[PDB]
Design an enzyme around this catalytic site. Structure first.
Site, short mmCIF file in Angstrom:
data_model
loop_
_atom_site.label_atom_id
_atom_site.label_comp_id
_atom_site.label_asym_id
_atom_site.label_seq_id
_atom_site.Cartn_x
_atom_site.Cartn_y
_atom_site.Cartn_z
N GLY A 14 15.15 -41.82 35.28
CA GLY A 14 14.47 -41.92 36.74
C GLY A 14 13.59 -41.48 37.41
O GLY A 14 13.22 -40.56 35.87
N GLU A 17 16.51 -38.14 32.89
CA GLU A 17 16.96 -39.46 31.68
C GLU A 17 18.93 -38.97 32.52
O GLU A 17 19.52 -37.76 32.54
CB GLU A 17 16.95 -38.83 30.61
CG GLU A 17 17.76 -38.34 29.39
CD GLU A 17 16.65 -37.96 28.70
OE1 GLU A 17 16.84 -38.93 27.34
OE2 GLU A 17 16.27 -36.71 28.20
N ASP A 118 19.26 -44.53 50.38
CA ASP A 118 18.91 -45.56 49.53
C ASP A 118 20.22 -46.60 48.05
O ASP A 118 20.30 -46.73 46.91
CB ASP A 118 18.17 -44.78 47.87
CG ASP A 118 16.66 -45.93 46.93
OD1 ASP A 118 16.85 -46.56 47.88
OD2 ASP A 118 16.53 -45.10 45.79
C1 22K Z 1 22.93 -40.19 38.96
N1 22K Z 1 23.87 -40.43 37.87
C2 22K Z 1 23.84 -41.68 37.30
C3 22K Z 1 25.33 -42.29 36.63
C4 22K Z 1 26.02 -43.28 36.21
C5 22K Z 1 27.57 -42.84 35.58
N2 22K Z 1 27.57 -44.26 34.36
N3 22K Z 1 26.08 -44.44 34.52
C6 22K Z 1 25.57 -45.59 33.64
N4 22K Z 1 26.32 -47.09 32.83
C7 22K Z 1 24.49 -45.60 34.17
BR1 22K Z 1 23.48 -47.07 33.43
C8 22K Z 1 23.42 -44.98 34.82
C9 22K Z 1 21.96 -45.41 35.02
C10 22K Z 1 21.33 -44.50 35.16
C11 22K Z 1 19.79 -44.52 35.13
C12 22K Z 1 19.77 -44.85 37.00
C13 22K Z 1 20.53 -46.34 37.01
N5 22K Z 1 20.61 -46.54 38.25
C14 22K Z 1 21.79 -45.76 36.03
N6 22K Z 1 24.05 -43.76 35.22
C15 22K Z 1 25.36 -43.67 35.43
C16 22K Z 1 25.97 -41.23 37.73
N7 22K Z 1 25.58 -40.34 38.54
#
Ligand code: 22K
Length: 259
Positions: A14, A17, A118
């Site tokens: 993001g 990471e 967002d």
């Molecule tokens: C902030 N946050 C992330 C999590 C998070 C929890 N599970 N997860 C999975 N499975 C993915 Br794929 C991503 C990705 C992580 C990078 C950005 C993507 N939008 C999502 N983030 C998450 C919980 N809080």
């Protein structure tokens, strides 16, 4: 050993990471947001307020030097974005269930005076049972405190999802902005495409919608019932836009659906 975690894989990046961590003893899994490194302080503070089944839970934060470590609920089903087939969307009953869950999460946040700012499929995650979880509070803010509302003025969000008033007005109410983004998410789930690059006068697709040309995509792909709800959500004037209590009374919202 119960405090020991193994970083097993990168979930994505993001904007540091986010990594998947597994407890060495319990095998419990947790997402770890790693930031290199004020903004992070606010994200943790808002996270500490969150306790709802459709919102990513916050477990705590560790600080090993200049790197911040946010421990968050792991969502094994990944992003809602990946359940959207390009140009197709997904089965209406699936879209309705996700929409119901998204509204539950948003009602919860608004009830505690928090706006996400967002909302989009990349930020709406899924657990092992495909339950939707609102993630990422890095852009979130307080819009109600001590029962007094504060107007927003900061530009933020993601263009295709942003409400028109953000682009046009100096100040605006928080809630209708999140309602609008939920309407764009619903459109994406039912059509597999975003309706416009941004809701501006200069955007032809947005003008077409304002002119009610629903015989064009993506509208043509959407059944009349959910389309009627979208007509109420994607209203330019935020003061006229449907509120969540009224979305809950909508005909499609309450239509029993089954694949
Ligand atoms: C902030 N946050 C992330 C999590 C998070 C929890 N599970 N997860 C999975 N499975 C993915 Br794929 C991503 C990705 C992580 C990078 C950005 C993507 N939008 C999502 N983030 C998450 C919980 N809080």
């Amino acid at each position: 050993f119960v405090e020991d975690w193994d970083l097993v894989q990168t979930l994505g990046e993001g904007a540091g990471e986010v990594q998947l961590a597994v407890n060495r003893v319990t095998e419990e899994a947790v997402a770890v947001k790693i930031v290199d490194m004020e903004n992070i302080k606010k994200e943790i503070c808002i996270n500490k307020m969150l306790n709802h089944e459709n919102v990513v839970k916050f477990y705590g934060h560790r600080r090993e030097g200049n790197i911040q470590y946010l421990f968050l609920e792991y969502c094994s089903g990944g992003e809602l974005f990946d359940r959207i087939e390009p140009d197709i969307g997904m089965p209406e009953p699936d879209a309705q269930r996700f929409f119901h869950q998204l509204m539950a999460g948003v009602v919860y946040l608004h009830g505690i005076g928090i706006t996400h700012r967002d909302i989009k499929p990349e930020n709406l995650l899924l657990d092992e049972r495909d339950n939707l979880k609102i993630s990422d509070f890095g852009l979130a803010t307080v819009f109600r405190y001590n029962n007094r509302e504060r107007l927003l003025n900061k530009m933020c969000g993601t263009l295709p999802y942003v409400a028109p008033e953000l682009l046009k007005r100096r100040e605006f109410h928080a809630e209708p902005v999140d309602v609008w983004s939920c309407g764009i998410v619903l459109t994406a789930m039912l059509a597999g495409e975003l309706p416009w690059d941004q809701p501006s006068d200069s955007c032809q697709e947005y003008s077409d919608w304002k002119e009610k040309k629903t015989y064009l995509n993506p509208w043509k792909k959407i059944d009349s019932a959910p389309l009627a709800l979208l007509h109420k959500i994607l209203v330019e004037n935020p003061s006229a836009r449907i509120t969540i209590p009224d979305i809950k009374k909508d005909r499609w919202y309450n239509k029993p659906l089954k694949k």
